[PDB]
Every structure is written in structure tokens, then in C-alpha cells.
Amino acid sequence: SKFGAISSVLNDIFSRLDPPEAEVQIDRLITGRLQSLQTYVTQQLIRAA
Amino acid sequence: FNATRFASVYAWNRKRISNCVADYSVLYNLAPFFTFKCYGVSPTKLND
Amino acid sequence: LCFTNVYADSFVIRGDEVRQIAPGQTGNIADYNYKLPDDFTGCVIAWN
């Protein structure tokens, strides 16, 4: 999932752009995927209980 | 670049180029010393 | 605010190439003459 960015491929963002806004794009991607992982962990905790 | 005769300056030629692969590096072998002024683009980054 | 140490580097470059003095930029000057780090901090002053 693009998570609101231009492309969903990390190395594509690295190669196709300069560091200034590539950093913003990668920040967005990391935040989105970390949030998804947190949601999965919470679901697993509830199911375990 | 290897034509026998070039057109006069007042009736200057016009050549269109499209759908081709261009290797500009060869253009560095024309003369030992020659002007290569480029506007708006660095000559060393013309191959990308 | 005040800093630990200050480095000053001065030179003369062409007018079109002034945009190449920036973090993450590429070209003749950026690659073969003067490279800036991606996490650069500080200022550039360019005057004709």
C-alpha cells in the first residue's frame, strides 16, 4: 500500500528522487507500516487473552 | 558531423532527430581543442 | 544560536551551475568538483 505516497516501492523512491523529499516519503511509509504492525500485535494480544 | 559541405549561415539547415539512441561521447573526438558550450544542461549528464 | 566551529569555503562557478551547490544534487560540479553531504547544515551565499 502506498500509504499516501507517490510509489509503494522503497528503492524506487530512493532512486527516482533526491534525499530532501525522499526522506518525507520514507517517513510516511515507515509510519504507516509501523502502525499496521502495531494493530496486528494488538489483535494478537486480544486473541491470546 | 561528417558531411562534405555545410549549408550557408543565412540558409542554415534544419534536421529533426527522433526515435534513436544518441551517444554524445563521440562528439569529444572532433578536435583536440574545440568549444563545447552547453546551456541549461551539463554535458557530462547527457547520457541519462 | 551559536555553534562549535565554522568552516568557510569560497570559489567561483558559472551562473547556470549555482543550483548544483545543494544537498542531493547531481551534475558535473556536484560529482567531480564539489560534493555536499545529504545531512548538510549551514548556508550558501552566491552573488554575481
SS (H, E, C) chain B: CCCCCCCCCCCCCCCCCCCCCCCHHHHHHCCCCCCCCCCCCCHHHCCC
C13-48 b/e (C-beta count within 10 Å ≥ 16 → b): eeeebeebbeebbebebbeeeeeeeeeeeeeeeeee
| Residue C15 grid coordinates | 551562473
Touching, A vs B (3+ Cβ pairs under 8 A): no
Q: Which of C10, B18, A17, A1 is nearest to C21 (CA)?
A: C10
Q: What is the resolution of this structure in A?
A: 3.5
Q: Where would I find the beta strands (DSSP E) of C1-48?
A: none
Taking CA atoms, what residue in C is nearest to A14?
Answer: C24
3-class secondary structure for chain A? Answer: CCCCCCCCCHHHHHHHCCHHHHHHHHHHHHHHHHHHHHHHHHHHHHHHC
- Residue A15 near chain C (CB below 8 Å): no
